[PDB]
A paper describes a structure:
PRDM (PRDI-BF1 and RIZ homology domain containing) proteins comprise a distinct branch of known and putative protein lysine methyltransferases (PKMTs). All PRDMs contain an N-terminal PR domain that shares the canonical SET domain methyltransferase fold, but with only 20–30% amino acid sequence identity. The human [name] protein consists of an N-terminal Krüppel associated box (KRAB) domain, a nuclear localization signal, an SSXRD motif, a pre-SET zinc-knuckle motif preceding the PR domain, followed by one post-SET and a distal array of 13 zinc-finger motifs at the C-terminus. Biochemical characterization of [name] catalytic activity with a histone peptide (residues 1–25 of H3) as an in vitro substrate indicated that [name] is the most active histone methyltransferase characterized in vitro, trimethylating H3K4me2 with a kcat value of 18,000 ± 900 h−14.
To better understand the molecular interaction between [name] and [name]-740 and mechanism of inhibition, we determined the crystal structure of the [name] catalytic domain (residues 195–385) in a ternary complex with SAM and [name]-740 at 2.58 Å resolution. Clear electron density for [name]-740 was located adjacent to the SAM-binding site and allowed unambiguous placement of the inhibitor molecule. An analysis of the intermolecular contacts revealed a network of largely hydrophobic interactions between [name] side chains and [name]-740. Additionally, the pyridine ring of [name]-740 forms a π-stacking interaction with W356. The pyridine nitrogen is presumed to be protonated due to the basicity of the isolated 4-aminopyridine group (pKa = 9.2) and forms a long-range electrostatic interaction with the sidechain of Asp325. Significant additional interactions were observed between the adenosine moiety of SAM and the two central rings of [name]-740. Collectively, the extensive interaction surface between SAM and [name]-740 explains why we observed SAM-dependent inhibition. The binding position of the substrate lysine is sterically occluded by both methoxy groups of the [name]-740 benzene ring. In the [name]-740-bound protein, the substrate recognition helix is flipped in the opposite direction, thereby preventing the enzymatically active conformation seen in the mouse structure. Taken together, the structural data are consistent with our biochemical results indicating a SAM-dependent, peptide-competitive mechanism of action (MOA) for [name]-740.
Numbering used by the authors: 195 to 379
The structure:
Amino acid sequence: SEPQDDDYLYCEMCQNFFIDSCAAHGPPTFVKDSAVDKGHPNRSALSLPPGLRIGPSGIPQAGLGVWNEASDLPLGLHFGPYEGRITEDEEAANNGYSWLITKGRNCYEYVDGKDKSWANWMRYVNCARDDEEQNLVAFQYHRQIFYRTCRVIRPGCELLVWYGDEYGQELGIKWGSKWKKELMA
Ligand SMILES: COc1cc(OC)cc(-c2noc(N3CCN(C)C4(CCN(c5ccnc(C)c5)CC4)C3)n2)c1
Ligand SMILES: C[S@@+](CC[C@H](N)C(=O)[O-])C[C@H]1O[C@@H](n2cnc3c(N)ncnc32)[C@H](O)[C@@H]1O
Ligand SMILES: [Zn+2]
């Protein structure tokens, strides 16, 4: 069939959707987690890619965060997938660590990263408070959540994430409507 709504990627330089590669800026770059057996008690921390550090958040009273150290993270760098336990119970939502996975017309599942032994490092990423400090966008791709860079992130800066059209409720309400197809060029 046609690509599903979550079979599209987004080119942050063109500001439009594409399928395999942007004709001007190429396929995106996916960063792989460090390998760790699922179920391992400090797996989340251990999965962290090289170049990043977990540490106290620059956002006050917000526990831990994830910070860039090695070098400049470029635009259209993709992290993930967000790992965790898969659940249809509503109890998982708003425990702090669950993302919505859209499975149909307003139909959902949760990926619950609370349990450290099942999650990955992305559970430690805090949310942006405003568009200006936001440097990651959470979105659904292949029934999974990824975070992509929407700014160049210099060494020393915290990864801060939020979402929009391509995630959760907005994605579920419009599901099947082929709306990204319209926004290619
Ligand atoms: C998988 O982790 C998740 C998933 C999630 O929602 C699906 C929310 C959170 C989450 N963690 O903390 C918070 N709150 C802190 C206080 N508070 C500031 C907010 C977070 C940021 N919000 C916005 C709104 C508009 N534009 C931007 C840039 C950000 C406002 C509510 C709520 N929310 C974490
Ligand atoms: C996915 S976690 C982020 C990692 C978390 N800081 C930790 O130490 O486990 C989400 C939780 O962190 C806290 N948090 C994340 N972003 C925040 C923000 N912008 N302001 C206040 N608290 C935040 C909230 O308690 C939320 O339930
Ligand atoms: Zn492009």
